Symmetry: C2
Subunit: 272 residues, 2 copies
C-alpha cells in the first residue's frame, strides 16, 4: 500500500503484515535496499507472532522522491513518523540495516515514548568521518554516468581485492535483484543525506532510555569502528559481532544473525 | 547561452561578457541568487576592461538539475570546471558571494594553476557548524510546503526582530525578483549540499598560493566568525569588513564594497 503526503508529494510504499493486535516490528532497509531484502525476515517474524511493518525509503523501488530530490536525515525520520502515525503504532521495536539503523536511532531519540527498542544491523547513531564517505563519490559517479545495473556490477566484482563482494553467485544475484530497483536519484540523495546526520544522536539515543541493540559484521570496518565508539558512550547497549560477516550481511542471511535477533526480541517482549 | 552535459544532463546557463582577450572574472551567486543579482557588477566590471563570466547554479533560474536532485559541493566545483574549460579560460579571478565564495575556495584549492585570486563576499572556505545550518530546516519546509514566493515573503519580514531584512522596499523588491527565480528543488539541494563541504578546504586554499581576499558584512555573524577563523589560518588573506552590512550585501550594493573590490582587482591585475 502507499502513504502519500500532500505537502511533500512523497508516496511511501509499505507493507503491514500480520495481525493488527500483535507486537509491531518495523524493518528499515539500507541504501540500495528495499522490502525485497527482508523476505526471509518477514516470514520468520510473522511465524514468531509479530506484526511486521516494512517500507521503502525515498527513491528506492516503489517509493518516489516527491517535490524535491534532496533531503536531510530529518526528512527520513519525518517520513517514518508519518508512516507509524498512519498505522496507529504506539510502541514498537525497529530493526534497521545500515542507514535504517541510523534512522532507528534518530527516531528513538526524537520519540522516546514510541519505541521499546532498536536493533541496528551494521548501523549506528554516529556521524561518519569524511574518510568513511569518500567511496560514495565514485559510486554516485557510476550511478549517474552508467546507471544502477552497472553500478551493481562494479560493486559485485573486486579486481583489486582477494575476493568479490559475495562468494556465492546466489547471494550476488539476490543483491542484483534488490539493488537494481533503486533509482539513480534515490541512491544519490541517500548517500548525500549521510552528511546531514547530527553529531548529537548518540546523546539523544542514550537519553531516550530505549533498549539499544546492535549486530555488526566483524569485516565491516566502518561500522565496527562506529559501533565500538557507540558502546563506549552507551554502555547499556547490547552489541554482538558476527565473525566473518560484512556490510551486506542481510543478503547473506547467516543463521547466527537470527539466533541473535530472536534472542534480543525475547528480551524486548519479556518487558512489554 | 547553455552548457549542457551529456553525462549528468545539467544545462548550465551562463553569460560571457566583454572581449575574449580581456582578463576574465567569474561571478558566482549565492543560494537563492542568479545572474540578475550581478547586473550592476557586470556593467561596472566591463567598464573597467574585464571579461565577465557569470553562471547560474543547479536549479537556480535558467539552470536545471539534471538527472539527479541532490549533489555534493564537489559536483558544483565540477560544473564550474566544465564551464571554464568550455570557455577556454586558463587563469582568472573568481568573485563569489556566500556559497559562491565556498565554491571559489574549493576550485582554487583543486586547480591552483587556474586561478590568480579569489574574492569571497560573505563566504569562506570553512565547513559550517551544525548550529549555523539549523535555520535551513525551516526555510526548506516553507519552500516545500508553501513555495518560493512565500519563502521570500517570510525572509523579508521579521516580526521578532527590531527590523526587516532590508530597510528599503526597493532592496526588498530586488531580492524578491532574484530569489523567486530559484526552484524549490534547487533551493533544497543547495542548502543540503552545504553539509558536504570538506573539512580541509582551508588547508587546500592556503596550499594553492592564490591571492585570497574576503569582504564580509559586520552584521553577518556566521560569516564574520568563519572568516575570522579563516584569517587565523591563512594570514596572507586580505580581509575587509563592511560596517553595518549583512549577508545580502549584494542586494544593497553599498558603494564601499566596490571601492574595496576595485582595489583588490588592481592588486591582482598589477601582478598578471
Amino acid at each position: 500500500p502507499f502513504l502519500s503526503s500532500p505537502s511533500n508529494s512523497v508516496s511511501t510504499y509499505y507493507e503491514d503484515h500480520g495481525d493488527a493486535r500483535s507486537y509491531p516490528l518495523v524493518l528499515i532497509h539500507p541504501i540500495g535496499g528495499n522490502i525485497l531484502i527482508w523476505d526471509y525476515e518477514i516470514q520468520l517474524l510473522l511465524k514468531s507472532g509479530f506484526r511486521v511493518i516494512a517500507y521503502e525509503l525515498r527513491g528506492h523501488h516503489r517509493t518516489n522522491m516527491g517535490k524535491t530530490g534532496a533531503y536531510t536525515m530529518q526528512d527520513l525520520i519525518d517520513d517514518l513518523r508519518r508512516l507509524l502515525e498512519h498505522l496507529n503504532i504506539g510502541k514498537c521495536t525497529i530493526i534497521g540495516h545500515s542507514i535504517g539503523g541510523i534512522i532507528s536511532s534518530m527516531y528513538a531519540a526524537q520519540h522516546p515514548g514510541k519505541v521499546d527498542a532498536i536493533i541496528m544491523i551494521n548501523g549506528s547513531p554516529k556521524k561518519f568521518q569524511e574518510k568513511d564517505l569518500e567511496k560514495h563519490f565514485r559510486t554516485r559517479e557510476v550511478a549517474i554516468t552508467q546507471g544502477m545495473k552497472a553500478l551493481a556490477e562494479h560493486k559485485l566484482v573486486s579486481l583489486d581485492e582477494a575476493r568479490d563482494l559475495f562468494a556465492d553467485k546466489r547471494h550476488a544475484d539476490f543483491f542484483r535483484e534488490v539493488f537494481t530497483k533503486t533509482s539513480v536519484e534515490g541512491f544519490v540523495a541517500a548517500t548525500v543525506a549521510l552528511y546531514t546526520i547530527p553529531g548529537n544522536v548518540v546523546q539523544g539515543l542514550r537519553a531516550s532510555g530505549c533498549k539499544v541493540f546492535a549486530i555488526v559484521g566483524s569485516d565491516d570496518d566502518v561500522f565496527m569502528r562506529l559501533i565500538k565508539e557507540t558502546k563506549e558512550e552507551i554502555p547499556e547497549m547490547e552489541l554482538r559481532v558476527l565473525q566473518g560477516s560484512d556490510h551486506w550481511v542481510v543478503i547473506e542471511k547467516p543463521k547466527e544473525m537470527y539466533d541473535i535477533l530472536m534472542g534480543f526480541l525475547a528480551i524486548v517482549t519479556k518487558d512489554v
